[PDB]
């Protein structure tokens, strides 16, 4: 009966905890998609904010990992930032360890490690976050790895996650400068979502050769003048 | 059977005592927070369970270092551990480093701790949802930190038991006053708000407690509202009902 | 970490009920065999692709644990790649910096069997959900094929499978099998046996396989070592195997 | 201290000084720097005033133990081997152990004494005759002079008196004569007239 | 907390029993059988094999030398039996490098059996799974056969059985054996012991694990083709 | 560390875990103790009998145990006590008292009642000997809830109320057992309600009677 | 220096398909001499190790390297090569980095597959193809092999020639002496020969 | 099902365990606290098992300037003073300070809050009042397990202890401007507890009072002390 | 189950209250202070004949004028008293003075709930009985509550509910110590399922000039017959 409660096997080899953070991953009911360029990774991340009260500049699920790496979370912001916070430090140890900066790649492997201590020690819950790593490798060029509550990570050519993750990538796989990957981006997710955006409701993250960074509001709003044109 | 445990997901993927404990925070008495345009106003009623207890001597706003407030509702004792964390982070900040602790870096610290007791089974999750704020070298800042370690940034922030209609109150603020609050208007407007949020709480009397930090009024650092200006907020909240 | 008990106990029957789940949890995984022949063993999988976005190149169910030792699951994936990680260090710690050699197979496997007992009987820890086909050969057993069960037993074999259809691959197998296997008979029966297994592709992108054979020196990244030899690990790449299938 | 140790056909013969001195005095004249280990085998120490004492008796209990739990007595090879890895431990150890022992003993299986020697250091050695620190430097002489494998008991005893006899003349302290003790098939006795 | 999920492994029973030894030794009963026997001249280690494919000639999972004089049958879970031996062979050896002899076969048997006890007593961790047959050769009483079981107790025997069918074959044994059987007379007991014991139709030598120690003591664990060969002499071929 | 309280109090006042460790003391096998003027016996009732080992076992020179119950459990106990001899010996310079012994013991088994994560010993012990120079016999009992108490005859084990029966209706405290002969006579008429006999004299003089002595001793009765 | 502490000598040398080792056999306290039955060459299966220095810890490694190849053989079924048992010295050795023993190890051995006589000297491993020295006279033992040893020698040349060398050297040195043993180690046999030396 | 531990909150978001160790002060002795501007006074009605036997002590004294009063478990309260003892301790040793009051009961605050968020331990069942006087005046500190610690003019806990309560409400105005007369604070008190006795009077070895001032170190009366009072 | 520290819904800890209910089944001990000293008295319980009642030591020493007696899981009871032993000799090395006896209560009482996950409480009741210059003759009542008071007359264990009584009725301040001795055993006989004499019964007393002495059964005997 306890089963259902700490990750243990049950009687049918699976592991519930684990598939109830996999549910846990769409709380926040946002939609994200990353796509690579020949040079850049873009992550587009619905910005849902729908209190007034609130100060949208703070509302984001995009973290700078590193200098290079950027990573966009599916899941709630708690366990969202618990999982940044301890990216960011394996990314400067393994600078301060090993000489140079960690590719995208080994950081979505650490990750996924602890997520699987997480699933075989009973008194650690899995965190309920899905973890994408983007960056453009000195060695690979651009890169998308994405993490789940399970330990399991593997690169992408594009993925999304979310609620409406499948008609995403479905839109994707039909179709299969960094301003047009990102125009790119955000046409491909209005048309898969069938929803436009407005400036504040898109979050946006460029992994470029020399640094990730985040599109401002300004910037999301050029983005989106230049689809209109 | 999934809300017997602090670290257990339900099916839906929900931790139903970080729902229990957010109940325990609606509970609480009503505390606000207003972000002006140079500074931060804290507020909170502070129900007199008794005539015997001593006016203006059970404070519950708490200075974090010099320049951060933090008011809380729910289980007071949680708050005060909170705070307590809270403090030991700015100390430890301040001595690695130099400059006091931006308010940023201190919501992080504040929220991984409370992220952080949810993911055990022996230990319980806080009970308190924390608005707290302060002035740093980028300006003020307002955050509300949830039981479960969420929190935001916020133009104004309301927790308790009078949360709903505050938060209506300061919606009409924010719409009101697009151009960005003033320091002691924004002390008096918290008057009216707490006065009218304690409309839920009418079956007992209450006591107001204001405190600020702005850049001007304060000088950037966290004080308490007292004296004429308190006062002035009073009967300007008074005067508000009618 | 409250949880110093043991979450595997005896039942009434005597069953070790955690460990009968991740021994189901194994028979529901990718279908793995590995063949040993008398020159080589061939250790081979299938690449089962969550999204047809994802980059299969990326996830590699074949694992280098020493240069003459490759390593192939079905089961968890995370736990293989845990499984994997210790392995190596414990192939390094407990015997190359001891010997100045990398360890023969059996003692290798005997250590990850170490590791998953560990998980079997201590406390706070489910047992691996995996099985291990361990391919290996050293310089006085030869060549020789493992397989680990979650329970930490450990069995040597001459052909086995492990995984979603393991009873009807070990068939084909006692079929085909014979002591006078050459590697690349192995490496056809293999491919055969992984067809059989296979749902949908069949090509070099869906299929992982790794043979311990030949020592490669021109693997090896430097010259000058007459007695340093070179891997025998080798991974046939999806060139390799799409070649061996269109002449199959 | 002098401690003596001469393996005859038969037996094992220990003889130890007697004098104990602090300082200024001689404090006694009596002392017997030997323990009982098991009923047939005993152990002669010398060295350091208080380490000596304190390793001798933590050995007499550890052997005591041993015996106890096993119903069963260790050979005076096994407890040679066992106070070597002592003396070994102590050597490395926060403060070794100043203590330099002959192991006298009867192996009731081959039927045959054991005379062991173990310097503080840990170097054990199977020897027909031994002495620690300047003991043997007069008495080495007279010993590969006339030990012979076959001596019995008389013999040995005479040739230990006449070894004494020389260390009391050319050595500049007064030892205040020595105790004499005998390991044999019989058990371990006391020679109270030498 | 954790209180709720904990299995309560060392606990007693209200009949005074513990339930997970006695778990384990209903999960060494369906484990296969071994057997021992000791004869005037030395002792005799057989065990059944509980597929075709399998590498029958590299596979030693029931017998394990512990010594130079020492060797295990083992019967139950494989994986806890090599944590245990391995733990008696750093004890032997222990022993050896603190007094230079070799270790008495009880000793080992006890410090094996003790390690057994204290995962029984405390720890909150099952028990270990296994029975031994423990073969042995020291001076003091020369060939010696001890068994142990997941509770810790030890017990010497002249000729004992662990695994499944225990009873049968002890009941096989009593039938048959006689205190001055020669080695070789022990080794023709152990292998009709085996066959009439066997859950299978047959017995044959890929089934088989056989081992004896014989007078200095010499430990030989048989190869495939000497059982084929005990097998063909003996009768059942 | 495991520290799972596995003895507590039920409603009822009692610790359960104790009460089931003295059920599986009373399904252990054998310990009868008879004391005399200057004996104290101690019996009990395809294996190999030269590697079994006796149920008596030799603390020190002078004190010898016998138990009852789970033999591994046993063994540990049994250490400990000869553990604590030995040091007892090497610090305070002398040998242990039989009551200090028995003190030493039921002190461990009354730990193991009340320290988390640990079960009792399901082991009750009769402790018999001399205190050192001393000839007065003594024989004292040990049980898992750690009680201790000195006996003039006492039986743990299986048939423990048959033959404490016999042993009151036949043992009297105003005359004990006059001889060894007596004590060893009465030890075996109890047994017979196979057998062992050891008997424990002064000056740690512990001897295990030879089979023909008490083939002799059970053809008289 | 507790190396000569006790004094003695240990050399090895190859000659055609055989290993020989040598040692003297005086134990040792500074000048006085206390045993002259004191081996310092061990063979764990058919690798032969030779340990000078401190005569305490030649025992203790020597049951150390007994403790270490018996869990070897139990592992692994089969006996470690004087190649595998070189590395497992060298880690020993720097396992007490510094804690150190005082002692200088020599191997010798003929692996057992290979069938090429090996031997080497001491953490950093001297793997010399001639011959290896240790001791108190290690500067007598190089003249004296330096001069004398010549390749390929069979097993009689090479164990007159290990002999003369170990006679000479420690016939020059103060603290070895008293009786000398060399070890002929080929594949199918060994012959261990006790020398006729000066006994001051 | 919610009411096992302290560390599991229920769905309407209480702690059932904290709850029974506020009912654990319930079923305590009541004992009252009140205080003017210079003097502040505990009185307490102690309780006797049999009446052969003594009176559970119920006022413990910290100092020179401080003490408390219990109602509830007697060794939780033994623990909290000894606590406040070490704190004050500190206090006096690192500063040559004497401990505000304010300052001992957030301690008291903190220490018994660590036992409501963590398993294995109990909150404490016990409930206390600590007097004291500091360069800022008279304190009186209502402490609950829960970790609530208020700063009230008077106050009383334990059984019964309403009608107490009711009456310093009733008399507030009156008693905290008594001022500097300490007998009529004292007096204002034993009426306050007899307030709250049912069958039960006040007796020369029932009561106990303790006072602490500004010229008044912390006294506690007790036997023939308290026969002027009663 | 239920942790071991739980409170119930009425304020008192379950294994508390466990431990009392396994008080309630212990052997009776009755102690009584006066003037010139304090006697106390156990009900010995021997369970067989040929248990040697000699060895029942319900009775010890603590100090040199502080004794007590137990009732109960007499197990827990040695501990308890070992470290009231530590504690009093502690102080005497501490002050170079005496322990106080409530000192000595307080002490042992410390240990009372110090545990959870110390497994469980002690199952033992004391009658702590001793003398000093500040206090004279005193009786406490330790229990594993924590809690102990101080009493003229006190009996616990299974007799406890008539003994108590009686010892109401009976006791007055002005009791000399041999009437003391004559109360405690008639309270005996009366509660005590055996008939009295002194093979089953101990009587112990504690004056400032003869400290703690335990009576022998010669002259507990000679006072029985008194009876």
Same mark, same amino acid.
């Given at each position: ?24 991953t769409?709380?926040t ?9 020949? $040079? ?11 209190d007034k009260?609130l $100060?949208?500049?703070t509302?984001?699920?995009?973290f ?7 990573m ?7 366990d969202?930032r ?8 394996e990314?400067?140890?393994?600078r301060y ?8 790649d080994?950081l979505?492997?650490?990750?996924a ?7 075989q020690?009973?008194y ?7 973890l ?5 490798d ?13 330990g ?19 839109n994707?796989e ?10 790119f981006?955000?046409?491909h997710?209005? $048309?898969?979502?069938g929803?436009?955006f407005?400036?504040?409701d898109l979050?946006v993250?460029?992994?470029?050769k $020399?640094?990730?960074?985040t ?9 989106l ?5 | ?14 931790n139903?005592?970080?729902?229990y404990?957010?109940?325990?925070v609606?509970?609480?008495?009503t505390?606000?927070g207003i ?7 804290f507020?909170?009623? &502070?129900?007199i ?6 006016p203006?001597?059970?404070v519950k706003?708490?200075?974090?270092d010099?320049?951060?407030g ?12 909170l705070?307590?964390?809270g ?6 900040? &301040?001595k ?13 610290? @504040? ?25 740093? &070298? ?6 509300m ?26 919606? &009409?603020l ?12 924004a002390?008096?407007?918290?008057a ?13 009397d209450f006591?107001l407690?204001?405190?600020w930090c702005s850049?001007?009024?304060?000088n ?5 509202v007292?004296?004429? @200006?308190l ?8 005067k508000?009902?009618? | ?7 595997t106990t005896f039942?009434?029957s005597?069953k ?9 949890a ?14 080589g063993?061939?250790?081979?999988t299938?690449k089962?692709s969550?999204?047809?976005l994802?980059?299969?190149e990326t996830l ?6 020493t240069?003459?030792?490759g390593?192939?699951?079905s089961?968890m ?5 845990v499984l ?8 390094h710690?407990?015997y190359?910096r001891?010997?100045?050699e990398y360890?023969?197979?059996?003692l ?21 959900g ?10 006085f057993?030869?060549?020789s094929?493992y397989?680990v069960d979650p ?6 074999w001459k ?5 979603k259809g ?5 068939t ?12 690349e008979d192995?490496?056809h ?7 059989e ?6 090509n ?11 020592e ?17 690990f ?10 061996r299938?269109e002449?199959? | ?5 001469i ?8 003889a130890?000084?007697?004098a ?5 005095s ?5 002392d017997?720097?030997?323990?009982q280990?098991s009923?047939?085998?005993?152990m002669?120490?010398?060295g ?13 209990a550890?052997?005591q ?12 090879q096994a407890?040679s081997?066992?106070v070597?890895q ?13 203590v330099?022992?002959?192991?006298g003993?009867?192996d009731?299986?081959?039927?045959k004494?054991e005379?062991?020697?173990? %310097?503080?250091l840990?170097?054990?050695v199977?020897?027909?005759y ?5 003991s ?6 007279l010993?590969?002079?006339?030990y ?5 008991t008389?013999?040995g005893?005479?040739?230990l ?9 050319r ?12 390991? %044999?098939?019989?058990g371990?006795?006391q020679v109270?007239?030498? | 907390?954790?209180?709720? *999920? ?5 606990i ?7 339930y997970?030894?006695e ?6 009963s369906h484990?296969?059988?071994?057997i021992? !026997?000791?004869?005037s001249?030395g ?12 590498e029958q000639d590299?596979?030693?999972?029931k ?5 130079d004089?020492?060797a295990?049958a ?16 750093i004890h ?7 007094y230079? =002899?070799?270790?008495?076969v =009880?000793?080992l048997?006890?410090r094996?059996?003790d !390690?057994?006890?204290?995962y ?5 961790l ?10 042995? *050769?020291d ?6 056969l001890y ?6 107790? *030890? ?7 662990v695994?499944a ?7 096989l044994?009593?039938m ?10 022990? !080794? =023709? ?15 044959? *030598? ?7 120690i ?8 048989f190869?495939?083709? =000497? ?11 | 560390?495991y520290?799972?309280?596995l003895?507590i109090?039920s409603p ?20 009868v103790?008879?004391?005399g ?5 101690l019996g ?7 590697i079994?080992?006796?149920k008596?076992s030799?603390?020190?020179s002078?004190?010898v145990?016998s138990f ?10 049994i250490?400990?006590?000869?553990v604590?001899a ?5 610090t305070?310079?002398?040998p242990?008292?039989?009551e ?9 088994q009354?730990?193991?009642?009340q320290? #988390?994560?640990?079960?009792?010993? #399901?082991?009750?012990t ?5 205190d050192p120079?001393?000839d007065?016999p003594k024989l004292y ?11 003039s005859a006492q039986?743990?084990?299986?048939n423990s ?5 016999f042993?009151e ?8 057992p ?11 008429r ?10 424990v ?11 023909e002595?008490?083939?002799?001793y059970?053809?008289?009765? | 220096d507790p ?5 003695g000598?240990?050399?090895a040398?190859?000659?055609?398909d055989?290993?020989?080792?040598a040692?003297?056999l ?5 000048s006085?001499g ?8 061990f ?15 030649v ?7 007994r403790?270490?190849?018996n869990l ?11 190649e595998?048992?070189?590395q497992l010295?060298?880690s020993?050795?720097?396992?007490r ?7 200088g ?12 006589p090996?031997?080497?000297g001491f ?5 010399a193809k001639?011959?290896?020295?240790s ?11 330096e001069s004398?040893?010549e390749p390929?020698?069979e097993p009689?040349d ?27 180690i080929?594949?199918?046999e ?9 006994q001051? | 099902?919610?009411?096992?531990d302290?560390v599991?909150?229920?769905? /309407? ?17 009541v004992?009252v606290?009140?205080?003017?501007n210079?003097?502040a006074?505990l009185?307490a ?5 049999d009446?052969?036997?003594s ?6 004294k ?9 109602a ?8 909290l ?6 704190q004050?301790?500190?206090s ?5 300070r004497?401990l505000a ?13 660590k ?7 109990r ?17 009186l ?6 970790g ?9 806990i334990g059984?019964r202890?309403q ?10 105005? /009156? ?15 034993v ?7 049912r069958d ?16 008044t170190?912390? /006294? ?8 002027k009072?009663? | 189950?239920?942790?071991?520290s739980?409170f ?16 309630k089944?212990?052997?009776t ?15 010995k ?16 020493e603590?100090?040199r ?6 009732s109960?899981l007499?197990?827990?009871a040695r ?10 000799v502690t102080?005497?090395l501490?002050?170079?003075?005496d322990?106080?006896v409530?000192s000595?209560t ?5 240990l009372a709930?110090?545990?959870g996950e110390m ?12 003398h000093?210059?500040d206090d004279?003759?005193?009786?406490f ?8 008071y ?9 007799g406890?509910?008539?003994?108590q009584?009686?010892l ?32 089953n ?9 003869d400290?703690?002495?335990?009576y ?9 017959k008194?009876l």
């Open positions: 009966g306890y089963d259902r409660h700490i990750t243990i096997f049950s009687p049918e080899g699976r592991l519930y905890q684990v598939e109830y953070a996999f549910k846990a769409n709380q009911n946002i939609n994200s998609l990353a796509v690579r360029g020949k $040079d850049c990774t873009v992550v587009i991340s619905q910005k849902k904010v729908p009260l $100060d949208p500049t509302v984001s699920y995009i700078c990992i590193s200098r290079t790496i950027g966009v979370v599916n899941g709630p912001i708690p969202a618990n999982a940044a916070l301890r990216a960011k430090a990314a400067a140890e393994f360890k090993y000489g140079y900066d960690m590719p995208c080994v979505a492997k650490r990750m490690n602890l997520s699987q201590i997480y699933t020690r009973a650690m819950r899995p965190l309920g976050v899905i994408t790593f983007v960056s453009v000195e060695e690979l060029g651009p890169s998308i790895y994405k993490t789940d509550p399970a399991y990570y593997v690169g992408y050519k594009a993925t999304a996650t979310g609620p409406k993750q499948q008609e995403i990538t479905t994707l039909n179709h299969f400068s960094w301003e047009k990957v990102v125009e981006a955000i046409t997710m209005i $048309d898969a979502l929803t436009e407005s400036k504040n979050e993250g460029v992994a470029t $020399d640094k990730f960074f599109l401002s509001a300004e910037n999301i709003e050029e983005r003048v230049a689809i209109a044109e | 059977g999934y809300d017997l445990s602090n670290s257990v997901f339900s099916p839906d993927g929900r139903f005592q970080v729902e404990a957010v109940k325990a609606e509970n609480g008495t505390s606000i972000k002006c345009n140079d500074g931060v106003v507020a909170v009623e &502070k129900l369970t008794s005539k015997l207890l001593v203006q001597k059970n706003i708490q200075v974090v010099r320049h951060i933090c008011v809380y509702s729910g289980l007071i004792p949680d708050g005060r551990h705070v307590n964390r403090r030991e982070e700015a100390a430890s900040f &301040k690695l480093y130099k400059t006091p602790i931006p308010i940023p870096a201190f919501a992080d610290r @504040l929220g991984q701790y409370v992220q952080a007791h949810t993911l055990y089974n022996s230990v319980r999750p806080f009970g308190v949802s924390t608005i707290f704020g302060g002035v740093d &070298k980028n300006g003020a800042h307002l955050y930190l949830e039981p479960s370690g969420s929190y935001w940034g916020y133009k104004g922030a309301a927790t308790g038991k009078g949360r709903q209609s505050a938060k209506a109150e300061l919606e &009409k924010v719409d009101h006053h697009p151009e960005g609050l003033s320091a002691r208007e002390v008096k407007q918290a009216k708000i707490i006065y009218l949020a304690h409309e839920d709480n009418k079956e007992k006591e407690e204001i405190s850049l001007s009024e304060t950037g650092l966290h004080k308490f007292k004296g004429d @200006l006062q002035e907020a009073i009967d300007f909240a008074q508000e009902i009618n | 970490d409250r949880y110093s008990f043991s979450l039942s009434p005597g070790l009920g955690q460990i009968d789940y991740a021994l189901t194994v028979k529901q995984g990718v279908t793995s065999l590995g063949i040993k022949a008398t020159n063993v061939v250790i081979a299938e089962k969550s999204s047809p994802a980059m299969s590699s169910k074949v694992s280098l644990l240069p003459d030792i390593a192939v699951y089961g994936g995370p736990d293989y790649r994997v990680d210790k392995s190596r260090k414990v192939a710690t407990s190359k001891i010997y100045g360890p023969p197979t059996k290798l496997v005997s250590e990850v069997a170490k590791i998953m007992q560990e998980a079997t009987q201590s406390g706070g820890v489910r047992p691996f995996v099985s291990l086909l361990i391919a290996g050969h050293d310089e057993n030869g060549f094929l397989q329970s930490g037993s450990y069995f040597p052909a086995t499978a492990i995984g393991s009873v009807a691959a070990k084909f197998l006692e079929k085909r099998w014979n002591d006078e296997l050459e590697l192995a490496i029966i293999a491919l055969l046996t992984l067809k297994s296979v749902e949908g592709e069949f070099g992108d869906t299929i992982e396989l790794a043979i311990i054979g030949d490669n020196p021109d693997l090896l990244g430097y010259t000058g070592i007459p007695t340093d030899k070179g891997p025998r080798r991974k046939l790449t999806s060139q390799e195997i799409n070649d299938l002449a199959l | 201290d002098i401690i003596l140790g393996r005859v056909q038969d037996s094992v013969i220990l130890s000084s007697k104990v001195t602090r300082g200024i001689v404090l006694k004249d009596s017997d720097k030997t323990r280990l009923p047939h085998t005993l002669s120490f010398a350091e005033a208080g380490d000596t004492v304190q390793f001798a008796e933590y050995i007499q550890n052997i133990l041993y015996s106890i739990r096993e119903d069963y007595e260790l050979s005076p407890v081997s066992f070597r002592e003396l070994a431990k102590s050597i490395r150890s926060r403060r070794p152990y100043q330099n022992v002959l192991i003993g009867y009731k299986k081959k039927n004494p005379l062991y020697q173990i %310097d503080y840990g170097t054990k199977e020897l027909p031994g002495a620690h620190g300047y043997g430097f007069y008495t080495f002489f010993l590969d002079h006339h012979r494998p076959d001596m019995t008389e013999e005893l005479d040739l008196k006449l070894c004494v006899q020389e260390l009391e003349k050595m500049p302290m007064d030892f205040k004569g020595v105790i004499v003790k005998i390991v %044999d098939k019989d371990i006795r109270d007239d030498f | 907390g954790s209180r709720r *999920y904990d299995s309560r492994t060392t007693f029973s209200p009949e005074g029993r513990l997970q030894v778990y384990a030794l209903e999960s060494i484990a296969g059988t071994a021992g !026997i000791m004869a001249d002792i005799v280690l057989a065990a059944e094999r509980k597929s075709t494919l399998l590299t596979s030693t999972e017998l394990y030398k512990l010594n004089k020492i295990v083992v019967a139950g879970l494989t994986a806890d039996a090599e944590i245990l031996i391995n733990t008696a062979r032997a050896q222990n022993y050896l490098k603190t230079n =002899e070799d270790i008495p =009880e000793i048997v006890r094996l059996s !390690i057994k006890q204290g029984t007593q405390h720890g909150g099952r028990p270990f799974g296994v029975s031994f047959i423990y073969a042995g *050769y001076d003091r009483y020369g060939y010696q068994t142990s079981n997941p509770s810790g107790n *030890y017990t010497g025997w002249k000729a004992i059985s695994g069918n225990t009873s049968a074959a002890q009941t044994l009593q048959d054996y006689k205190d001055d059987m020669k080695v070789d007379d022990a !080794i =023709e007991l152990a292998l009709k012991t085996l066959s009439k014991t066997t859950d299978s139709s047959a017995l044959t *030598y890929d089934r088989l694990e056989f081992a004896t014989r007078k200095e003591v010499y430990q030989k664990i190869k495939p083709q =000497e059982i084929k060969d005990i097998l063909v002499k003996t009768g059942i071929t | 560390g520290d799972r309280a003895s109090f009822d006042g009692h610790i359960f875990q104790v009460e089931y460790a003295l059920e599986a003391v009373k399904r252990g096998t054998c310990a103790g008879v004391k003027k200057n004996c104290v016996v009990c009732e395809l294996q190999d009998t030269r079994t080992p006796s008596v030799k603390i020190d002078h004190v145990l009852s119950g789970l033999n591994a459990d046993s063994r540990i106990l250490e400990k006590a000869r604590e030995q040091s007892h010996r090497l305070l310079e002398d242990v008292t039989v200090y012994l028995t003190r030493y013991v039921a002190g461990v009354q730990r193991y009642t320290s #988390g994560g640990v079960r009792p010993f #399901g082991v009750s009769l402790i018999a000997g001399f120079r001393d007065e009992q040990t049980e898992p809830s750690g009680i201790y108490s000195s006996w039986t743990i084990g299986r109320k048959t033959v404490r029966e042993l209706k036949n043992y009297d405290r105003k005359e004990p006059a001889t060894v002969e007596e004590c060893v006579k009465l030890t075996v109890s047994l017979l309600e196979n057998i062992e006999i050891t008997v004299k002064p000056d740690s003089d512990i001897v295990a009677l030879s089979s002595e008490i083939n002799q059970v053809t008289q009765i | 190396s000569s502490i006790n004094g000598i240990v050399v040398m190859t000659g055609k055989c290993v020989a080792i040692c003297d005086r134990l040792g306290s500074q006085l206390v045993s002259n039955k004191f081996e310092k060459i063979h764990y299966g058919h690798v032969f190790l030779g340990i000078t220095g401190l005569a305490t810890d025992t203790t490694l020597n049951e150390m390297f403790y270490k190849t070897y053989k139990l592992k692994e079924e089969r006996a470690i090569e004087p595998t048992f070189t010295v060298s020993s050795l720097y396992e980095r510094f804690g150190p023993y005082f002692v190890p020599v191997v010798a051995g003929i692996n057992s597959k290979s069938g090429k090996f031997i080497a953490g950093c491993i001297d793997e001639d011959f290896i020295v001791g108190t006279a290690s500067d007598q033992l190089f003249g004296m092999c004398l040893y390929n020698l009689e090479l164990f007159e020639t290990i002999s003369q060398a170990l006679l000479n050297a420690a016939d020059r040195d103060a603290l070895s002496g008293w009786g000398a043993v060399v070890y002929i080929k594949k199918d060994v012959v261990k020969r006790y020398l006729k030396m000066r001051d | 099902n919610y009411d096992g302290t599991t909150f229920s769905p /309407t978001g209480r702690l059932f365990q904290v709850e029974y160790a506020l009912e654990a002060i319930k079923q305590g002795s004992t606290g009140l205080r003017s210079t003097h006074v009185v009605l102690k309780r006797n098992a009446e052969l036997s009176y559970q002590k119920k006022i413990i910290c100092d020179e300037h401080m003490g408390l009063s219990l509830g478990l007697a060794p939780d309260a033994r623990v003073s000894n606590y406040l003892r070490q004050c301790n500190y006096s040793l690192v500063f040559n004497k009051v304010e300052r001992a009961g957030h301690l008291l605050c903190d220490k018994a809050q036992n409501t968020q963590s398993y294995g331990g909150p404490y069942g016990v409930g206390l009042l600590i007097i004291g006087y500091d360069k800022s005046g008279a304190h500190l209502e402490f609950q397990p829960s609530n610690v208020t700063e009230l003019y008077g106050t009383a059984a202890s009608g107490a309560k009711t009456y310093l409400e009733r008399t507030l105005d /009156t008693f905290i401007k008594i001022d500097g007369n300490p007998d009529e604070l004292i007096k204002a008190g009426e306050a507890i007899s307030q709250s006795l039960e009077s006040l007796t020369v070895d029932n009561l106990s009072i303790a006072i602490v001032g500004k010229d170190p912390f /006294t506690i009366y007790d036997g023939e002390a308290v026969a009072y009663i | 189950d239920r942790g071991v739980t119930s819904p009425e304020g008192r800890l379950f294994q508390v209250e466990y431990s009392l209910e396994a008080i089944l212990g052997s001990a009755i102690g009584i202070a006066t003037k010139e000293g304090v006697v106390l008295g156990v009900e319980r021997a369970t067989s004949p040929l248990l040697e009642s000699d060895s029942i030591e319900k009775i010890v603590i100090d004028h502080i004794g007590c007696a137990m109960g007499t197990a827990d501990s308890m008293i070992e470290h009231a032993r530590t504690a009093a102080h005497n501490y002050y170079d003075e322990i106080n409530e000595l307080q002490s042992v009482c410390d709930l110090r545990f497994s469980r409480p002690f199952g033992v009741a004391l009658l702590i009985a001793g000093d210059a004279g003759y005193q009786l009542h330790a229990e594993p509550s924590g809690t102990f101080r009493y003229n007359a006190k009996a616990i264990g299974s406890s509910e008539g003994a009584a009686e109401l009725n009976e006791w007055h301040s002005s009791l000399t110590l041999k009437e003391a001795e004559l109360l405690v055993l008639k309270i005996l006989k009366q509660v005590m399922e055996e008939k009295l004499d002194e093979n019964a101990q009587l112990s007393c504690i004056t400032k000039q400290g703690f002495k335990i022998d059964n010669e002259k507990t005997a000679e006072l029985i008194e």
